[PDB]
Design a protein around this ligand. Structure first.
Ligand SMILES: CCS(=O)(=O)Nc1ccc(Oc2c(C)cc(F)cc2C)c(-c2cn(C)c(=O)c3cc(-c4cc(C)c(OCCO)c(C)c4)oc23)c1
Ligand SMILES: CCS(=O)(=O)Nc1ccc(Oc2c(C)cc(F)cc2C)c(-c2cn(C)c(=O)c3cc(-c4cc(C)c(OCCO)c(C)c4)oc23)c1
Ligand SMILES: CCS(=O)(=O)Nc1ccc(Oc2c(C)cc(F)cc2C)c(-c2cn(C)c(=O)c3cc(-c4cc(C)c(OCCO)c(C)c4)oc23)c1
Ligand SMILES: CCS(=O)(=O)Nc1ccc(Oc2c(C)cc(F)cc2C)c(-c2cn(C)c(=O)c3cc(-c4cc(C)c(OCCO)c(C)c4)oc23)c1
Ligand SMILES: CCS(=O)(=O)Nc1ccc(Oc2c(C)cc(F)cc2C)c(-c2cn(C)c(=O)c3cc(-c4cc(C)c(OCCO)c(C)c4)oc23)c1
Ligand SMILES: CCS(=O)(=O)Nc1ccc(Oc2c(C)cc(F)cc2C)c(-c2cn(C)c(=O)c3cc(-c4cc(C)c(OCCO)c(C)c4)oc23)c1
Lengths: 107, 109, 109, 109, 108, 106
């Protein structure tokens, strides 16, 4: 019902129409490759879109509250780790604007 | 003690080494659950671990002492025993590498 | 024909799918000779191949036709049969994945 | 000389090193045209290149000499300068990393 | 709880981030290996970060006022002993700027 | 013979040369100093305490092997570091001491 609407939002963000600011969230942050030593000291529960897609197909979200929480966690990790100036916070805010809007229009 | 952790580093070095490649490789990187088709991996294993992550944590100074380092390596083996049935090959490789580990950890001065 | 490279994509997508993961995983990436201790690997295997390489070449559109695609995927399997003894798990996995390959290739328009 | 391939290996190891990670990351893997929505990338760029590929070729021993390595590492940067307009972040990161490359290549016995 | 932030502060003094200027303060001053035959007459109470670490883990510190006072003892000990010119005074200066700030940034 | 050598060691380790010998007393602690690349660049680590451990062992059969290891410790420090860092200056001040007393050996 609403779970089915949550897919279409998850699809809409994984979609290519926001790929220009959605890309830093398609896969988990690679702290090793990015040479980020403290990423996991600071981020207790990483999240990213692929990991949301995983949990969707396993049916690990019962409600939309659990789905929105992981998507919001993905964004909060980014706002937590990074300083406000960084270009990844600006794309998180653009992608989050897309999400919150699409989530608000849920029946 | 820094002597402990220096020796723990030595153990980690020995687990990653050439000589145990045959049975250590399954633990060089996190379990790629999506690549392996393992839908229920991260519902069963709350706290993944591997030797890449133990090197990272050690390099990062996340290990207060030798016990913290052992808890992780041991956690890596227990997840492997948790997720898998006893007769899968990966359980037999854990046990050989765990046997390398417990010995070296036991012999630590 | 772009039609037959279209079908080579399906073949690959199929080879890479969760369906076959249990025997497909060792061809997902190049053989890491370094990590696995294989000092003679690159002496014996002059032209390594694996499925990520194949995919990269596909997205690159480096395959002039389906025969080129097929020659790489078979090079992958022959590399494996050339290097390993015939009892090794990887050989039995290769034959498992190659039966899938030789079937979907064979049943292409 | 495989002595000059040794140094190119040092160069690569250096380009991949954590020091340059803030500007090297876009070249760590091939450009994902699908994921990024670049429906004209493969029309414009005929021979894509990135550092993973270079490493795989180095391990495969596909490079006859240092010149050949350099042509690939340079194809990576040109490809980037060709596709993108000059204002884009990624052109600025290319030039930054290419400065490390051009320096280290030049300091070669 | 304020001792929980203190421990976070100590975690940062010890991290790779400050390792070009914090290393003099990881172990106690080894006066005899250094040939500092006066150190222990001038510095009646040595301090260093591994002693702060080890005191945290016995719960030696009753409040933040006490954890602060040892990190500061460690810095004063450096300033008390050395000439203003020496490389190690600068390094304590630098690391103290990291301590004084993160201690100030403590919620209360 | 190595009594001349082991007397050279006691002198390098002693208090007279501590203000420039201090970085060579124990092995280089690359983790505590934050040097990821140190052990890939310095294959064979060396330091004076380890030189003392090799001696007590009676592993140094002949004086060249003692000299190659004191020299290696120094050659590691020149190999790893740029010339203008302080620790290359201190290595040079200690190797001056080492060399002008190893040269005066029967
Ligand atoms: C698709 C997952 S990935 O494979 O790990 N790829 C990836 C690539 C770039 C990322 O961050 C950016 C982004 C998004 C834009 C940019 F211009 C530069 C960087 C480094 C990021 C990235 C994502 N998120 C969510 C983050 O929170 C952060 C933080 C950082 C980051 C990276 C570096 C190197 C940093 O250090 C720069 C100076 O040392 C800092 C402060 C933050 O990078 C990301 C990720
Ligand atoms: C180096 C990390 S990696 O990039 O993800 N590579 C990797 C590769 C193979 C792994 O497991 C093996 C191993 C080790 C041997 C083998 F013959 C087959 C498999 C699947 C494993 C693997 C490691 N560990 C620690 C595990 O606990 C498990 C469990 C499983 C696993 C995989 C599959 C496909 C399974 O399904 C079999 C039929 O469905 C089961 C039951 C378990 O795989 C691993 C990992
Ligand atoms: C995703 C590629 S990877 O990152 O390099 N990971 C990987 C992991 C395991 C591999 O091989 C297996 C496989 C498939 C199953 C198994 F139970 C044990 C091993 C070692 C192999 C592997 C793949 N292929 C295609 C091979 O031909 C061979 C050969 C060998 C291999 C490995 C070791 C350690 C070997 O030595 C055994 C005892 O010294 C031998 C003889 C062969 O491993 C692979 C690769
Ligand atoms: C690790 C390879 S990856 O998995 O494909 N990830 C990746 C991530 C970011 C990339 O480029 C950046 C970078 C580096 C920073 C940034 F703030 C935004 C982008 C898009 C790029 C990237 C690399 N190179 C070499 C390129 O030439 C280009 C070009 C583009 C690109 C992307 C988008 C969305 C673009 O916008 C299309 C219209 O909206 C344009 C014009 C170019 O992205 C890359 C790649
Ligand atoms: C990691 C602790 S340790 O095992 O005991 N090793 C150690 C190593 C170097 C130390 O100080 C430095 C520093 C930091 C930089 C430098 F270029 C030289 C020295 C000697 C110091 C050191 C730390 N602190 C906090 C100090 O206050 C002082 C003072 C001195 C010191 C040492 C010597 C040899 C001194 O020279 C005596 C004249 O021959 C003087 C005047 C002061 O060294 C330290 C300690
Ligand atoms: C007694 C063994 S110990 O316990 O590991 N202690 C120790 C302490 C200081 C050392 O080097 C100095 C010295 C001597 C003075 C100084 F002000 C700063 C450092 C880092 C060194 C040291 C010794 N030798 C032999 C070296 O070659 C090097 C190189 C380095 C070193 C350290 C840092 C932080 C460096 O900076 C990294 C970039 O910021 C660089 C480039 C080199 O430190 C030592 C060692």
């Amino acid at each position: 019902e609403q779970l089915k609407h949550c897919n279409g939002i998850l699809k809409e963000l994984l979609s290519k129409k926001h790929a220009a600011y959605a890309w830093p969230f398609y896969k988990p942050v690679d702290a090793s490759a990015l040479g980020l030593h403290d990423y996991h000291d600071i981020i207790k529960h990483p999240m990213d879109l692929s990991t949301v897609k995983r949990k969707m197909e396993n049916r690990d979200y019962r409600d939309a509250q659990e789905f929105a929480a992981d998507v919001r966690l993905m964004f909060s990790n980014c706002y937590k780790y990074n300083p406000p100036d960084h270009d990844v916070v600006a794309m998180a805010r653009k992608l989050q604007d897309v999400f919150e809007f699409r989530y608000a229009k849920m029946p």
